[PDB]
Amino acid sequence: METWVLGRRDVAEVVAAVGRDELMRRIIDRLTGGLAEIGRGERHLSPLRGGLERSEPVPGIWEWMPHREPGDHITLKTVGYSPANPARFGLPTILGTVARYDDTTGALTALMDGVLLTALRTGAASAVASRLLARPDSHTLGLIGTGAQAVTQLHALSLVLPLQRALVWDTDPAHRESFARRAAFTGVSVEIAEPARIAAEADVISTATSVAVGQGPVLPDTGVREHLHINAVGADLVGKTELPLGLLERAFVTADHPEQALREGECQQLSADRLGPQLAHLCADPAAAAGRQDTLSVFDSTGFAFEDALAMEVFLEAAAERDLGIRVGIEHHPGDALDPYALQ
Amino acid sequence: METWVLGRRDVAEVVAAVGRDELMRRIIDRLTGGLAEIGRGERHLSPLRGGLERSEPVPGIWEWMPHREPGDHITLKTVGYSPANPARFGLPTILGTVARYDDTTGALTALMDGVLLTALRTGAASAVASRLLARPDSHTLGLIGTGAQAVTQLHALSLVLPLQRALVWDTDPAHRESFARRAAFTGVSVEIAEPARIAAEADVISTATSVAVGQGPVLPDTGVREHLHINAVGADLVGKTELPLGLLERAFVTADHPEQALREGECQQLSADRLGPQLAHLCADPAAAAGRQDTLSVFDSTGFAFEDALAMEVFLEAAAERDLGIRVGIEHHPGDALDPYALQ
Ligand SMILES: NC(=O)c1ccc[n+]([C@@H]2O[C@H](COP(=O)([O-])OP(=O)(O)OC[C@H]3O[C@@H](n4cnc5c(N)ncnc54)[C@H](O)[C@@H]3O)[C@@H](O)[C@H]2O)c1
Ligand SMILES: NC(=O)c1ccc[n+]([C@@H]2O[C@H](COP(=O)([O-])OP(=O)(O)OC[C@H]3O[C@@H](n4cnc5c(N)ncnc54)[C@H](O)[C@@H]3O)[C@@H](O)[C@H]2O)c1
Numbered sequence: 001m002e003t004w005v006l007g008r009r010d011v012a013e014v015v016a017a018v019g020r021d022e023l024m025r026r027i028i029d030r031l032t033g034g035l036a037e038i039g040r041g042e043r044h045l046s047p048l049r050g051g052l053e054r055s056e057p058v059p060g061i062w063e064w065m066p067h068r069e070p071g072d073h074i075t076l077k078t079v080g081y082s083p084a085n086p087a088r089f090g091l092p093t094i095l096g097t098v099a100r101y102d103d104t105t106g107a108l109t110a111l112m113d114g115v116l117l118t119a120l121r122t123g124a125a126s127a128v129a130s131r132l133l134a135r136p137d138s139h140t141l142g143l144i145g146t147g148a149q150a151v152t153q154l155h156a157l158s159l160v161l162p163l164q165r166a167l168v169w170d171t172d173p174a175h176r177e178s179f180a181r182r183a184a185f186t187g188v189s190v191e192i193a194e195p196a197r198i199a200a201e202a203d204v205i206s207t208a209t210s211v212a213v214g215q216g217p218v219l220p221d222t223g224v225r226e227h228l229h230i231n232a233v234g235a236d237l238v239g240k241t242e243l244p245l246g247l248l249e250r251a252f253v254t255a256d257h258p259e260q261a262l263r264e265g266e267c268q269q270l271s272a273d274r275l276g277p278q279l280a281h282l283c284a285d286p287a288a289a290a291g292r293q294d295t296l297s298v299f300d301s302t303g304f305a306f307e308d309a310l311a312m313e314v315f316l317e318a319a320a321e322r323d324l325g326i327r328v329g330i331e332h333h334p335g336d337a338l339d340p341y342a343l344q
Numbered sequence: 345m346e347t348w349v350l351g352r353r354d355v356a357e358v359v360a361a362v363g364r365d366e367l368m369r370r371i372i373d374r375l376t377g378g379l380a381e382i383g384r385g386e387r388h389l390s391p392l393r394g395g396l397e398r399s400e401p402v403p404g405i406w407e408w409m410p411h412r413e414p415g416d417h418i419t420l421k422t423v424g425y426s427p428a429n430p431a432r433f434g435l436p437t438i439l440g441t442v443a444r445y446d447d448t449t450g451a452l453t454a455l456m457d458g459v460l461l462t463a464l465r466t467g468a469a470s471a472v473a474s475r476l477l478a479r480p481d482s483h484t485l486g487l488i489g490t491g492a493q494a495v496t497q498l499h500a501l502s503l504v505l506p507l508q509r510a511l512v513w514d515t516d517p518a519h520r521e522s523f524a525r526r527a528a529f530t531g532v533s534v535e536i537a538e539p540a541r542i543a544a545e546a547d548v549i550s551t552a553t554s555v556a557v558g559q560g561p562v563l564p565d566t567g568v569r570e571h572l573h574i575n576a577v578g579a580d581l582v583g584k585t586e587l588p589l590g591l592l593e594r595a596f597v598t599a600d601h602p603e604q605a606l607r608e609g610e611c612q613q614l615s616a617d618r619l620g621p622q623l624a625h626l627c628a629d630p631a632a633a634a635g636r637q638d639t640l641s642v643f644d645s646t647g648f649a650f651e652d653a654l655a656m657e658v659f660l661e662a663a664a665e666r667d668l669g670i671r672v673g674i675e676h677h678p679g680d681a682l683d684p685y686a687l688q
């Protein structure tokens with residue numbers, strides 16, 4: 001037995017061969033079915049993630065996220081949020097890896113990049129929620145925060161809504177000015193616009209910022225369109241929020257993971273008895289979403305490990321088809337199972 | 345930037361090149377200093393490990409154990425306890441891996457086997473505690489459970505005490521028969537002995553069994569020598585214990601990790617108010633342990649992630665000196681930090 005390692009090269013070859021659109025659609029479809037299975041009680045939400053706060057060079061966090069499929073495998077994603085990474089080191093803010101362990105023996109069976117996978121399934125989750133809660137003729141997307149997640153927010157949403165334009169804002173002028181080039185492949189025209197204009201004109205918004213704890217909101221409490229749907233995607237430290245309390249109190253709020261969202265999502269700001277049914281329930285029974293497209297809605301997204309397990313399965317299916325990756329004997333399996341020093 | 349991976353073959357070469365005694369001594373020395381640093385408030389106990397119980401084929405657990413050295417690195421050990429592994433699959437009961445992440449950026453910098461490392465630092469921790477709490481002229485070691493951990497329990501304790509004899513028991517006759525061959529490199533004469541004889545004769549005992557929840561004790565509450573020191577090393581599921589309650593209530597008890605031990609150690613049997621100073625405090629101030637060498641003592645061992653980080657450092661230092669391991673690009677670092685699709 002050896003660990004199946006998908007290097008950065010193998011992950012790149014999967015998305016190159018399959019195509020960004022098709023790969024994103026596969027992950028959207030997988031997440032949709034998987035969320036519906038949770039909503040039907042056929043599967044369970046992942047346990048709460050844990051994390052270690054880091055103060056330097058700026059406040060960030062490093063988190064671990066398990067999800068068990070009993071009798072089959074356990075998925076663990078380890079992921080850092082380090083928002084000085086881009087400017088200071090030319091590294092992504094979100095850096096992670098995803099591992100799979102055999103549930104029967106405990107053995108490490110597969111290991112892969114989590115950077116691309118994280119951006120894909122986070123876009124896909126917003127797409128699942130926005131298909132339920134945004135107007136199906138939504139034309140104008142607003143983006144607050146135009147870093148890494150903004151790219152897959154725009155991409156995923158462009159596959160499920162007829163988006164024609166994106167109004168975008170970032171507090172870093174370089175990061176907002178570069179977004180059009182990163183977005184170009186989608187065919188959605190990009191225009192820089194201040195947050196008040198985005199609030200007034202957008203049919204759907206995604207907020208995905210590295211705003212510090214206590215420095216929200218990133219979208220002002222002002223007039224929005226009656227049917228606005230917001231994907232609140234930023235999430236890292238306890239205390240970090242993006243939306244104004246007044247807007248949230250007027251909204252139909254569905255969390256991907258209620259207990260996690262109450263700790264780390266916009267639901268930090270809300271009384272627990274004001275949550276709408278969670279996303280998995282909407283996927284299994286759309287009665288709870290019926291009519292909510294035409295009034296203010298918020299998808300409170302924190303991400304949870306089941307989404308990583310599902311996206312990992314999409315990657316492993318493609319990689320297995322193509323015989324991609326390498327085998328590394330990482331774990332020591334002594335010839336005598338009772339002898340740690342039998343270094344066979 | 346690529347991840348440094350030490351495979352099974354590199355770990356085996358470290359042992360072959362450094363030597364078992366020298367490698368174990370390095371890990372004992374690192375653990376003693378690190379624990380003293382915790383006892384002096386220069387470093388801090390790792391957070392509580394987390395875990396997922398599994399019921400098939402027999403009850404076991406899969407656990408994650410993070411530890412952070414601020415500004416340097418984060419260590420995470422992922423480890424399964426699957427006690428049917430030896431008989432059913434020829435695999436060790438304890439199967440795990442240790443990963444190292446840069447604390448500044450979050451990047452995965454190193455990954456190695458945790459099977460051998462786990463056995464080494466678990467023996468080392470018992471040796472640290474027993475040097476403090478066992479009579480320095482202890483001649484007879486008792487072992488209940490003669491699986492993988494027993495091998496390094498005997499090895500490490502033979503390096504810090506003048507052991508002449510090991511009295512050993514396992515409920516599996518083949519496992520107790522084979523222990524002497526697995527122990528031969530230590531030079532300590534092994535005898536098979538039933539638990540009541542071990543309790544009556546031993547100067548120091550380690551219990552390290554796969555006993556099931558609620559099926560203890562593995563050592564009877566009968567005559568023990570006045571000065572007996574016990575390393576309670578078995579630890580997996582909540583509810584699993586190895587010592588008789590009456591013995592525990594008479595003993596001076598020190599945990600490696602009080603909060604973990606209250607959940608998963610012998611201290612499950614004890615009121616929270618009943619524990620002594622933890623092992624770290626005894627390392628920093630051994631005056632609190634010297635006076636307990638001649639009375640009944642228990643080191644309640646659960647294992648915690650700091651031990652894995654320290655032992656991993658020993659292996660990385662030795663592997664670097666010998667240019668061992670491979671470099672694998674696992675994480676995706678896009679050429680544009682804000683573009684997840686910018687596959688370099
Ligand atoms: N919900 C999920 O599942 C999920 C998954 C991954 C990441 N995230 C979170 O999404 C957030 C963004 O991640 P990323 O990978 O895009 O990081 P990033 O660093 O690539 O982009 C964040 C951007 O937000 C901008 N920003 C900071 N403060 C702002 C403000 N007040 N207004 C507007 N823009 C602002 C920054 O200048 C930067 O360009 C983080 O909180 C991250 O932890 C969530
Ligand atoms: N404290 C720590 O840091 C730490 C580290 C690693 C493992 N552990 C724990 O130590 C225990 C042993 O692990 P291992 O790797 O040696 O497993 P192993 O399966 O190699 O050995 C366990 C042995 O215990 C024997 N056994 C079971 N029930 C018994 C009983 N009632 N009396 C006597 N013997 C019995 C089994 O026959 C087996 O030979 C496990 O609970 C493991 O989770 C603790």
Ligand code: NA
Nearest residue numbers: 232265266301
């Ligand atoms: Na959120």
Ligand code: NA
Nearest residue numbers: 576609610645
């Ligand atoms: Na214990």
